[model samples]
Target: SDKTTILIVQGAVSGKRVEVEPEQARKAIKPRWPANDGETLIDLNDLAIGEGRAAYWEVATEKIKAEAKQLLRRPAGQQPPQHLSIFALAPIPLLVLLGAEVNRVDVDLFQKHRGKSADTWCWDEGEPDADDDLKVFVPAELPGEIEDAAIIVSMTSIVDRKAVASAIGHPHHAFEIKARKPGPTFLKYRSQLTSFSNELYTILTTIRDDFRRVKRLHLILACPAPIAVEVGRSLIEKADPEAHVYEYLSPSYRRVLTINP
Candidate 1:
């Protein structure tokens, strides 16, 4: 139902991160605006954060796409408000990812890159004027974590739950995966991908640690095709030219693709 359309899917801001299914998160989205336009308020202050923030964008991106599609699918005369301002209480980078995905899908409603206006952190349809058709609201808080230097990144929901569990418990033997050089670690979903990859890039390059200097970055992708492209973009943007990347084909690794800077 449009009444339950979720606008924000965020992670809890605690040391212990809890995993939230995308299905469950979507259920929590309560429609905050009306079809008729003008100034509106969408409250997002009630969310309880638990899951780690990195992968949270995964679901948020999906939700935003679905909502944008729904908005676009409406009858020609049933249009929405024109201006949307996104606010993330925490200094999380996922908002940037969400903004990019929205711009890609909602061509008419593009994100504002710069403006003289004080409230410039927003998304708008075409150019802004005296009147706004719609206004979007986001919550203030989101989860955070100190990520590992190098690791095998995986989003196992797309593949096998049992298989992923087995691999996480007994690696190389079950999933035929290995992490060398930097350290044996993994960055599983706590968050999103196109925006996820973009967010990852923001953190890796800016963070104090040397994630860029890590020797290995083995990716065991089980996410959507587009997210993989974002991964490639992140690698090209940060990693060295000769970095070895392996794709997991069940119980083995096949080294493929070369990323150019």
Candidate 2:
């Protein structure tokens, strides 16, 4: 399971325009987004590209927070899909009531209502060294040797992968997705799932079009969340047997093997 981690090839880089190309045509290019140690990551369910279009895995995941409050609970009897809704303080606290780690990450909308932070404010604990004793949020931005880490981990204080992934799907790019879309139609979730799935590729495409160093990318995913795992399981199984889709499950996170196609 530890080896099942994903590493996407930074892709998408457009070529320089020739002298004959119009300045407007050259300026219409999109640049690749700069990434850091603290950006949301989306797992692209592998979709096949065809002459016209390709099929890709979409949103396929849901998170649930199990405090069981009526205000927080879904409309009575509205059995929602299994949301990996996580709201744990500390592993020791979760099981034996201990305090949480000190160096967790917290994020808010850059301009209150500008982006993903607008509707959903969140915090998370990032553990740079996995399978080690010091597993906690990336301290002051994960200082030392994550280079040797087996699997870096994150326990959100107030965030979810879905939001992180979706927020990256931006223009108003703040916390916009949270307030703009706040319903659960199951099918709607699926549609967005696909959209997010597509968004993953879009980002990769941007990378390819922008970064001159990258030629192709390889993506591996370890998302044990429900909808995503479900779609991964289903599609990998039936979408294309010839296509390789690695699957691994863990108590903390679902693992995926993604690479540039």
Candidate 3:
């Protein structure tokens, strides 16, 4: 039987990686390579496991859907049947799939970069994001104006549950995208996530082709951490350097392509 798949979709700008403010994950699973530790396991059947109502499947799927509903809060007549908080919802299946623990990472994606001084690129757009000038279309589900002229950058978000933040976090505070693995953190990810990225690229190319753009998607999360150095040496070298130009984040939404901060 085909296991019903769930995915998270979110947005990121073209350029350096933003330094996410790591929050306390609700039930984040600690990462274990090759084999999912499933550390965050709370049940045998994870949410949204299958289509039919098997005992385990129903228990888990209901939990996820219920939780998602709580998060998204579908209006009286129109319910989305799901929520968008990936970080909070990812643990269940992880347990079933890997039978291990969940790391429970609550990393918030800040639209603007802040750690410029220390070499950590927060990717903060500005007090008011420059893109704010583009246009605003508050559809029930989708975000701001959808773009027409954009390219399919080599990467795609694995966010199965992207969302508008709680009252605590504002609208653009960080859609709270998640990764079965350490995505968003690829800049600081310990092991190279080539396989995962490649798989995502293929998926997007097939389904969201219209949303794809040609601006040449790319980002370099500015962080002084040693992993940033590793990203430069290992990850960058592996990709087509010329084609995927990594630009360093400048102060206040400004930018330049220099290695020297």
Candidate 4:
């Protein structure tokens, strides 16, 4: 069957829970992909923290795991879902955690765009802009004995190198993946996100193969929710280094969650 299981993960934004209706997701995705099956909604609004809350991470982690398990449950004779379509509106960290929880499956991520003439979740119909293509920046030289590294993703907004230095002491190795032109609505085509996902997977695999001494990988994301989830899903459980995802709250960034640890 060409059935796709729609999954909506709604978490609180700024202490306010903004719900993404099922029909909205279906309306945005149906024309391009097949969602003949149904949807599994995982609402984490109540558990979302407006700012840093030390204890909330553990609670939210368990909640997402339980919800993911429930969404994957099927009847005795029923077949498993052919595809998973994710429509999420949440903090970058929570979305990454959600992505890690459902990493072992095929997923199509949808982003909600905001701006004049682009206030919807539907992907733009056409080729992606050549100038806005994904770009990877890797340091030419790395200290052979480095134990910690960072991956800075600048898509929606540029991430300052100094800010990362303040959060995690300047590491010997840092990798960057950015778009030529970064903006809130930069991602309009599905192909753009697909290429990003592929690049991220390649980067993670490279880290695993080349950076054997690295024990921790810090992820500083300034991108959209869809990209955040893709970052998490790209991580290989036992292969990739343990990832520490950070969330910025004004003056500083805090390590929010650790994935694949």
Best by TM-score: 4
The Cα local distance difference test for each model comes to 0.32, 0.21, 0.25, 0.80
Query: 113-225, model 1: which lDDT tens digit per residue?
Result: 23324222222224323221111111122212312122233332333334444433322111211111111111212122223544455544533243333333334444332
* Per-candidate total of colliding backbone pairs: 17, 56, 42, 0
Total clashes, candidate 2?
56
Candidate 2, RMSD to the unseen true structure: 24.1
Q: After best superposition, candidate 4 residue 75: deviation in angstroms?
A: 2.8
- Model 3, 17-117: lDDT tens digits are 22222222211211211112111212222223344423433354344344433434445786432211122122212111111111121112211112343
Ranked by TM-score, top first: 4, 1, 3, 2
C-alpha lDDT (0 to 100) for residue 105 of candidate 1? 30
State which candidate, 1 or 2, has the greater lDDT: 1
Comparing 1 with 4 on lDDT, the higher-scoring candidate is 4
Instruction: Give me the runs in candidate 4 sitting further than 4 Å from their true place.
Output: 31-38, 48-52, 116-119
Candidate 2 overall lDDT versus native? 0.21
Greater-TM-score candidate between 2 and 3: 3
Cα lDDT for residue 246, model 1?
Answer: 37
Instruction: Name model 3 segments beyond 4 Å from true.
Output: 1-23, 26-53, 74-199, 207-261
Question: What are the per-residue Cα lDDT tens digits for candidate 2 across 46-142?
Answer: 2233322111221111101122222123456664222221211111101110001110211111001113331221211233122211112211332
What's the TM-score of each model vs. the native? 0.28, 0.20, 0.21, 0.90
Q: For residues 66-109, could you state the per-residue lDDT of candidate 4 as single tens digits?
A: 98877677747886665688999878888888888888788888
